[PDB]
Tab-separated table of C-alpha atoms and ligand atoms in Angstrom:
chain	number	residue	atom	x	y	z
A	1	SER	CA	-9.104	16.917	-26.482
A	2	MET	CA	-6.306	19.235	-25.884
A	3	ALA	CA	-9.003	22.442	-26.527
A	4	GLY	CA	-11.717	24.495	-24.873
A	5	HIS	CA	-11.051	28.225	-24.356
A	6	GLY	CA	-7.510	29.865	-23.678
A	7	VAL	CA	-6.388	30.856	-20.745
A	8	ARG	CA	-4.479	35.097	-20.552
A	9	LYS	CA	-4.077	35.990	-17.308
A	10	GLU	CA	-2.149	38.213	-15.356
A	11	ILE	CA	1.469	38.059	-15.477
A	12	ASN	CA	2.565	39.617	-11.732
A	13	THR	CA	0.446	36.073	-11.050
A	14	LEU	CA	2.903	33.265	-12.328
A	15	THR	CA	2.342	29.775	-11.411
A	16	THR	CA	5.954	28.376	-11.835
A	17	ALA	CA	4.555	25.251	-13.337
A	18	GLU	CA	3.112	28.016	-16.153
A	19	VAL	CA	5.926	29.810	-16.437
A	20	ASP	CA	8.410	26.620	-16.713
A	21	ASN	CA	5.774	25.472	-19.667
A	22	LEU	CA	5.262	29.400	-21.140
A	23	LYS	CA	9.122	29.617	-21.002
A	24	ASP	CA	9.717	26.390	-23.330
A	25	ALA	CA	7.149	26.635	-25.036
A	26	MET	CA	8.469	29.775	-26.024
A	27	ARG	CA	11.436	27.862	-26.812
A	28	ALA	CA	10.113	25.445	-28.693
A	29	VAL	CA	8.438	28.412	-30.885
A	30	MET	CA	11.407	29.870	-31.389
A	31	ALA	CA	13.576	26.924	-32.756
A	32	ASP	CA	11.208	25.844	-35.382
A	33	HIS	CA	12.015	26.916	-38.415
A	34	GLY	CA	8.108	26.177	-40.097
A	35	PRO	CA	5.732	28.217	-41.014
A	36	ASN	CA	4.346	28.865	-37.580
A	37	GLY	CA	7.678	29.897	-35.865
A	38	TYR	CA	8.919	32.737	-33.752
A	39	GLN	CA	10.726	34.006	-36.998
A	40	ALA	CA	7.384	33.375	-39.271
A	41	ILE	CA	5.501	35.344	-37.216
A	42	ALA	CA	7.247	37.956	-36.367
A	43	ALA	CA	7.908	38.630	-39.705
A	44	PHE	CA	4.080	39.693	-39.971
A	45	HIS	CA	4.408	42.438	-37.536
A	46	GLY	CA	7.050	44.417	-39.739
A	47	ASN	CA	10.542	43.064	-40.417
A	48	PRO	CA	10.997	41.723	-42.590
A	49	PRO	CA	7.685	42.975	-45.225
A	50	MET	CA	5.306	40.446	-45.786
A	51	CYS	CA	3.095	43.213	-47.310
A	52	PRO	CA	3.114	43.312	-51.743
A	53	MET	CA	1.501	46.294	-52.253
A	54	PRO	CA	-0.087	45.781	-56.358
A	55	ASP	CA	2.945	47.257	-57.528
A	56	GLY	CA	5.011	45.546	-55.930
A	57	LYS	CA	5.932	47.562	-53.370
A	58	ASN	CA	7.009	45.962	-50.109
A	59	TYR	CA	5.463	47.223	-47.116
A	60	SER	CA	5.327	46.190	-42.703
A	61	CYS	CA	1.621	44.587	-42.620
A	62	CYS	CA	0.999	45.904	-38.978
A	63	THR	CA	-2.623	48.065	-39.529
A	64	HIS	CA	-1.116	51.331	-37.275
A	65	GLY	CA	-3.024	54.824	-37.338
A	66	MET	CA	-5.768	52.963	-38.180
A	67	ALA	CA	-8.963	51.949	-36.929
A	68	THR	CA	-7.937	47.967	-37.892
A	69	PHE	CA	-5.199	48.581	-35.863
B	1	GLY	CA	-9.366	46.722	-8.966
B	2	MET	CA	-13.058	48.084	-10.397
B	3	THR	CA	-15.197	45.717	-11.973
B	4	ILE	CA	-16.767	47.256	-14.982
B	5	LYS	CA	-20.066	48.970	-12.883
B	6	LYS	CA	-17.426	50.320	-10.574
B	7	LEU	CA	-15.236	51.473	-14.037
B	8	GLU	CA	-18.103	52.523	-15.249
B	9	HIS	CA	-19.150	54.578	-12.702
B	10	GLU	CA	-15.647	55.729	-12.143
B	11	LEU	CA	-15.806	57.360	-15.627
B	12	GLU	CA	-18.988	58.879	-15.498
B	13	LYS	CA	-17.360	60.771	-11.999
B	14	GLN	CA	-14.352	62.395	-14.002
B	15	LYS	CA	-17.529	63.698	-17.055
B	16	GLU	CA	-18.869	66.262	-14.096
B	17	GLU	CA	-15.684	68.134	-14.267
B	18	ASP	CA	-15.137	70.708	-17.300
B	19	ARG	CA	-12.444	69.863	-18.918
B	20	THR	CA	-10.094	71.650	-21.180
B	21	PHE	CA	-8.035	69.884	-24.334
B	22	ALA	CA	-5.176	70.110	-26.617
B	23	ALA	CA	-5.764	68.148	-29.798
B	24	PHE	CA	-3.876	66.927	-32.121
B	25	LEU	CA	-3.680	65.541	-35.819
B	26	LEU	CA	-1.669	63.419	-36.315
B	27	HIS	CA	-0.284	61.579	-40.277
B	28	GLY	CA	2.969	59.628	-41.090
B	29	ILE	CA	5.701	60.727	-39.969
B	30	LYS	CA	8.553	58.346	-40.907
B	31	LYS	CA	9.578	57.372	-38.333
B	32	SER	CA	8.762	57.026	-34.682
B	33	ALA	CA	8.861	60.199	-32.186
B	34	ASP	CA	8.203	61.144	-28.859
B	35	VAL	CA	6.451	64.469	-28.317
B	36	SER	CA	6.380	66.433	-25.366
B	37	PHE	CA	5.036	69.983	-25.447
B	38	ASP	CA	3.957	72.719	-22.091
B	39	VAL	CA	2.027	74.941	-22.028
B	40	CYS	CA	3.224	78.762	-21.097
B	41	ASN	CA	1.232	81.785	-20.101
B	42	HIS	CA	2.314	85.222	-22.114
B	43	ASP	CA	5.042	85.898	-19.302
B	44	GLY	CA	7.034	82.476	-21.155
B	45	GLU	CA	6.542	80.640	-17.925
B	46	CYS	CA	5.569	77.305	-18.320
B	47	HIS	CA	4.644	73.937	-18.273
B	48	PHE	CA	4.840	69.569	-19.106
B	49	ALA	CA	1.804	69.720	-20.660
B	50	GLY	CA	2.189	65.801	-21.641
B	51	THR	CA	3.806	63.457	-23.877
B	52	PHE	CA	2.846	60.681	-26.480
B	53	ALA	CA	4.466	58.754	-28.621
B	54	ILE	CA	4.207	57.651	-31.764
B	55	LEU	CA	5.408	54.762	-33.490
B	56	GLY	CA	6.859	54.558	-36.780
B	57	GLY	CA	9.389	52.943	-39.027
B	58	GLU	CA	10.482	53.512	-42.493
B	59	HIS	CA	8.491	51.180	-45.407
B	60	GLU	CA	4.698	51.953	-42.557
B	61	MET	CA	2.444	51.642	-44.655
B	62	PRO	CA	0.496	54.990	-44.702
B	63	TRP	CA	-1.998	56.578	-42.343
B	64	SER	CA	-3.779	59.516	-41.003
B	65	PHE	CA	-5.868	59.569	-38.365
B	66	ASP	CA	-9.654	60.555	-39.421
B	67	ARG	CA	-10.254	62.873	-36.333
B	68	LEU	CA	-7.892	64.492	-33.380
B	69	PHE	CA	-5.986	62.346	-31.270
B	70	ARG	CA	-6.999	64.318	-27.314
C	1	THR	CA	-35.882	14.472	-28.379
C	2	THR	CA	-36.578	14.636	-24.405
C	3	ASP	CA	-36.907	10.700	-24.361
C	4	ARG	CA	-33.117	11.476	-26.586
C	5	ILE	CA	-31.334	13.223	-24.016
C	6	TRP	CA	-32.249	11.186	-21.290
C	7	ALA	CA	-30.442	8.522	-23.654
C	8	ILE	CA	-27.633	10.748	-24.114
C	9	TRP	CA	-27.150	10.876	-20.495
C	10	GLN	CA	-26.936	7.280	-20.115
C	11	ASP	CA	-24.213	7.032	-22.918
C	12	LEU	CA	-22.463	9.811	-21.495
C	13	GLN	CA	-22.404	7.902	-18.279
C	14	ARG	CA	-20.382	4.586	-19.495
C	15	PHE	CA	-18.492	7.163	-20.614
C	16	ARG	CA	-18.077	9.185	-16.915
C	17	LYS	CA	-17.677	4.052	-16.529
C	18	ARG	CA	-20.969	4.661	-14.558
C	19	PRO	CA	-23.722	1.680	-14.793
C	20	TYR	CA	-25.645	3.035	-17.872
C	21	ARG	CA	-28.127	0.644	-16.862
C	22	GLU	CA	-28.849	1.414	-12.652
C	23	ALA	CA	-29.999	3.575	-10.618
C	24	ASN	CA	-29.395	3.715	-7.195
C	25	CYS	CA	-31.724	6.538	-5.960
C	26	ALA	CA	-35.247	6.716	-5.161
C	27	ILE	CA	-34.966	2.569	-5.257
C	28	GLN	CA	-38.328	2.227	-4.209
C	29	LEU	CA	-39.920	4.408	-6.610
C	30	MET	CA	-38.418	2.209	-9.843
C	31	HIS	CA	-39.387	-0.988	-8.818
C	32	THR	CA	-43.133	0.755	-8.327
C	33	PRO	CA	-45.479	0.004	-11.481
C	34	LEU	CA	-46.091	2.964	-13.544
C	35	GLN	CA	-49.806	2.604	-14.551
C	36	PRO	CA	-51.337	3.216	-16.950
C	37	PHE	CA	-48.974	0.494	-18.049
C	38	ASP	CA	-50.352	-1.251	-15.539
C	39	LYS	CA	-53.514	-1.904	-16.838
C	40	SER	CA	-55.381	-3.757	-19.546
C	41	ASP	CA	-56.866	-1.098	-20.691
C	42	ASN	CA	-52.837	-0.591	-22.847
C	43	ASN	CA	-53.129	-2.698	-24.826
C	44	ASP	CA	-49.608	-3.196	-25.936
C	45	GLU	CA	-47.878	-5.336	-24.645
C	46	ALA	CA	-44.428	-4.573	-24.197
C	47	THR	CA	-44.727	-1.639	-22.400
C	48	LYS	CA	-47.093	-3.129	-19.479
C	49	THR	CA	-44.226	-5.425	-19.143
C	50	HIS	CA	-41.863	-2.301	-19.489
C	51	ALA	CA	-43.655	-0.755	-16.580
C	52	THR	CA	-41.211	-1.411	-13.572
C	53	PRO	CA	-39.173	2.129	-13.879
C	54	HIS	CA	-36.005	0.139	-13.664
C	55	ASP	CA	-37.019	-2.392	-16.891
C	56	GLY	CA	-37.398	1.266	-18.868
C	57	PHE	CA	-33.712	2.525	-18.963
C	58	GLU	CA	-32.663	-0.148	-21.248
C	59	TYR	CA	-34.702	1.205	-24.662
C	60	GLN	CA	-32.392	0.079	-26.442
C	61	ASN	CA	-34.053	-4.115	-27.673
C	62	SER	CA	-36.340	-4.317	-24.564
C	63	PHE	CA	-38.017	-1.217	-26.499
C	64	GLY	CA	-36.438	-1.740	-30.535
C	65	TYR	CA	-36.129	1.918	-30.593
C	66	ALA	CA	-33.100	3.647	-31.476
C	67	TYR	CA	-31.591	7.173	-32.317
C	68	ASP	CA	-30.235	8.399	-35.315
C	69	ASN	CA	-27.093	10.007	-33.452
C	70	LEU	CA	-26.810	10.367	-30.150
C	71	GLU	CA	-25.145	13.935	-30.050
C	72	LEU	CA	-25.895	16.978	-28.351
C	73	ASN	CA	-25.471	19.956	-30.192
C	74	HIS	CA	-23.256	18.210	-32.862
C	75	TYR	CA	-20.992	17.260	-30.169
C	76	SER	CA	-19.841	14.294	-29.639
C	77	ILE	CA	-20.364	12.476	-26.162
C	78	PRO	CA	-16.430	12.270	-25.808
C	79	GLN	CA	-17.251	16.125	-26.622
C	80	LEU	CA	-19.837	17.116	-24.171
C	81	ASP	CA	-17.499	15.068	-21.704
C	82	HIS	CA	-15.139	17.714	-22.496
C	83	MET	CA	-16.926	20.609	-22.698
C	84	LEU	CA	-18.451	19.393	-19.295
C	85	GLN	CA	-15.155	19.246	-17.354
C	86	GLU	CA	-14.184	23.040	-19.070
C	87	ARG	CA	-17.760	24.645	-16.997
C	88	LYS	CA	-16.300	22.637	-14.158
C	89	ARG	CA	-12.823	24.633	-14.260
C	90	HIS	CA	-14.393	27.693	-12.671
C	91	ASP	CA	-16.153	28.320	-9.820
C	92	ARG	CA	-19.828	28.850	-9.965
C	93	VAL	CA	-21.887	30.280	-7.438
C	94	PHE	CA	-25.877	28.439	-7.558
C	95	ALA	CA	-29.585	29.603	-6.469
C	96	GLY	CA	-31.519	26.781	-5.648
C	97	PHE	CA	-34.816	26.194	-5.988
C	98	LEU	CA	-36.918	23.893	-3.740
C	99	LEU	CA	-40.425	23.069	-5.895
C	100	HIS	CA	-43.168	22.161	-4.184
C	101	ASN	CA	-44.887	22.584	-7.212
C	102	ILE	CA	-48.741	23.315	-6.548
C	103	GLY	CA	-51.324	24.307	-8.831
C	104	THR	CA	-51.470	25.428	-12.315
C	105	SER	CA	-48.524	25.633	-13.890
C	106	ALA	CA	-46.443	29.093	-13.412
C	107	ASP	CA	-43.749	30.654	-14.262
C	108	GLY	CA	-41.359	31.684	-11.905
C	109	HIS	CA	-38.466	34.806	-12.848
C	110	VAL	CA	-35.606	35.227	-10.350
C	111	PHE	CA	-32.440	38.697	-9.542
C	112	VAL	CA	-29.912	38.777	-7.008
C	113	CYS	CA	-30.750	42.247	-5.791
C	114	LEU	CA	-28.079	44.576	-4.538
C	115	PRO	CA	-28.128	46.490	-1.780
C	116	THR	CA	-26.905	49.876	-3.370
C	117	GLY	CA	-26.888	51.261	-6.391
C	118	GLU	CA	-24.471	54.073	-7.491
C	119	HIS	CA	-21.498	52.414	-9.491
C	120	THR	CA	-23.547	49.316	-8.793
C	121	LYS	CA	-26.234	47.916	-11.530
C	122	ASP	CA	-29.442	48.297	-9.848
C	123	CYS	CA	-31.754	44.850	-9.874
C	124	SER	CA	-30.535	42.623	-13.010
C	125	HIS	CA	-33.909	40.932	-12.760
C	126	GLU	CA	-32.584	38.300	-15.183
C	127	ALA	CA	-31.490	35.910	-12.862
C	128	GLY	CA	-32.750	33.428	-15.255
C	129	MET	CA	-36.059	31.783	-15.291
C	130	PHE	CA	-38.081	28.436	-15.052
C	131	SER	CA	-41.139	26.931	-15.724
C	132	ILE	CA	-42.970	24.266	-13.993
C	133	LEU	CA	-46.037	22.639	-15.768
C	134	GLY	CA	-49.020	21.307	-13.670
C	135	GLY	CA	-52.364	21.684	-13.545
C	136	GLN	CA	-55.244	20.934	-10.789
C	137	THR	CA	-55.417	17.128	-10.878
C	138	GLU	CA	-51.868	16.728	-11.153
C	139	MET	CA	-51.164	14.571	-7.797
C	140	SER	CA	-48.784	17.208	-4.750
C	141	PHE	CA	-45.276	16.037	-5.126
C	142	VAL	CA	-42.470	18.009	-3.773
C	143	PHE	CA	-38.465	18.215	-4.780
C	144	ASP	CA	-36.417	15.190	-2.734
C	145	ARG	CA	-33.454	18.011	-3.433
C	146	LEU	CA	-33.251	21.680	-4.827
C	147	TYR	CA	-33.631	22.310	-8.040
C	148	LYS	CA	-30.262	24.289	-9.464
C	149	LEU	CA	-29.507	27.053	-11.171
C	150	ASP	CA	-26.604	28.901	-12.271
C	151	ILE	CA	-26.220	32.516	-11.008
C	152	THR	CA	-22.569	32.740	-11.228
C	153	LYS	CA	-22.319	34.682	-15.188
C	154	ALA	CA	-24.766	36.857	-13.810
C	155	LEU	CA	-22.953	37.725	-10.849
C	156	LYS	CA	-19.729	38.353	-11.882
C	157	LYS	CA	-21.413	40.991	-14.830
C	158	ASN	CA	-23.126	42.640	-11.368
C	159	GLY	CA	-19.531	42.495	-10.471
C	160	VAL	CA	-20.722	40.541	-6.517
C	161	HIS	CA	-19.079	38.169	-5.412
C	162	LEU	CA	-20.176	34.974	-3.456
C	163	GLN	CA	-19.541	36.946	-0.514
C	164	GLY	CA	-21.348	40.026	-1.202
C	165	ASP	CA	-24.429	40.589	0.580
C	166	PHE	CA	-27.547	40.682	-1.999
C	167	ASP	CA	-31.264	39.460	-1.735
C	168	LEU	CA	-32.781	37.215	-4.082
C	169	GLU	CA	-36.221	38.538	-5.704
C	170	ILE	CA	-38.470	36.280	-7.031
C	171	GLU	CA	-41.713	36.597	-9.409
C	172	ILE	CA	-44.550	33.822	-9.969
C	173	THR	CA	-46.642	34.446	-12.019
C	174	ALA	CA	-49.158	31.742	-13.584
C	175	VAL	CA	-50.348	31.246	-17.145
C	176	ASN	CA	-52.842	32.928	-16.359
C	177	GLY	CA	-50.659	35.990	-16.029
C	178	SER	CA	-52.323	35.674	-12.162
C	179	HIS	CA	-49.736	36.776	-9.347
C	180	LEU	CA	-48.968	33.937	-6.960
C	181	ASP	CA	-48.429	34.718	-3.151
C	182	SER	CA	-44.171	34.381	-2.730
C	183	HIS	CA	-45.079	34.765	1.156
C	184	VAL	CA	-45.758	30.588	0.903
C	185	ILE	CA	-43.154	29.620	-0.988
C	186	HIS	CA	-39.358	29.477	0.541
C	187	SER	CA	-36.840	31.143	-0.072
C	188	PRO	CA	-33.976	29.962	-2.530
C	189	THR	CA	-30.511	29.403	-0.955
C	190	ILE	CA	-26.803	30.416	-2.251
C	191	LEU	CA	-24.950	27.723	-3.052
C	192	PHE	CA	-21.205	27.946	-4.304
C	193	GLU	CA	-19.030	25.310	-5.270
C	194	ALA	CA	-15.627	25.075	-6.447
C	195	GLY	CA	-13.819	22.353	-7.797
C	196	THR	CA	-11.195	20.112	-5.699
C	197	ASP	CA	-8.966	22.916	-5.170
C	198	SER	CA	-10.639	25.697	-2.890
C	199	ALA	CA	-8.770	28.758	-1.121
C	200	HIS	CA	-7.093	28.914	1.649
C	201	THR	CA	-7.909	31.693	4.512
C	202	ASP	CA	-6.617	33.977	5.424
C	203	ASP	CA	-7.371	34.367	8.723
C	204	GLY	CA	-6.575	31.449	10.971
C	205	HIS	CA	-4.014	28.764	9.992
C	206	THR	CA	-5.088	25.444	8.275
C	207	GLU	CA	-1.879	23.734	8.139
C	208	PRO	CA	0.699	22.829	11.697
D	301	CUO	O1	3.454	47.361	-32.274
D	301	CUO	CU1	2.342	47.035	-34.182
D	301	CUO	O2	1.683	47.662	-32.533
D	301	CUO	CU2	2.109	48.041	-31.163
């Protein structure tokens, strides 16, 4: 099983193996076209705009200037 | 370096002294901007008060803070 | 349920590929017959045959009773194994108690007090507690080994490291609520447990 919790650690303490895996994983992430792709995820933040408002207007999804941020 | 317990202690220490603050009311200014403000005496002598930034862009959702930024 | 958990451990053991029905500890005790099961007072023939604890391990077919499911907290056996490993991941510090449980049952509470206040938390007073069941009737028994309890979370919370000097304070209370003299009981030890990867030293040089 590959499960458990992920560990987020400091960047300055970069361990070569860790960095390699990240770079490779990121590379693959960037490559994939799928919805769980780099482009798709990035889209959530702002452009292209992912959010609909009921008028049909499109706006950036990220919540800023709010408690929810 | 501080531990949680330590940090809390550190923070309280800050509380001990009186402080003066400038408060800003911020709302969506349709863009990202950097603000710098200085405190000036009547003389006109000024010193750099501080800086804060606003992240934004077109098609941002509208927002306004309920309270002031200190 | 406790018996079921024992069974659970047993099945996990096989996952580990350790022998399921094999104990290589307290060999002397295992062979001993277990009274009163041994005696005629016990009509149950199966139990009498079962008296040696060694035979006890295989509940299945011996006892002829099964459990609907052998899982802990809805975790599959393989799931538990994986779960166990994760726990292993972090370094851990434990307090060990030598239990010479004697007298009536009592509850014990303990926490590690730190020498300073200030910024640092005062005595958390809640390392954890364990209880011991007992009565006057009980035959004297002493644990061969220490009883380990994982202090790590609390210690980290207080922000102490393993190295940090700290004392352990223990309070023993009877069910009655009478305080028991802690002096007689030996103080608990602090053990630090790490995985294979251990730390290298600052002072001195390990490699030649
Ligand atoms: O950008 Cu939307 O917040 Cu960091």
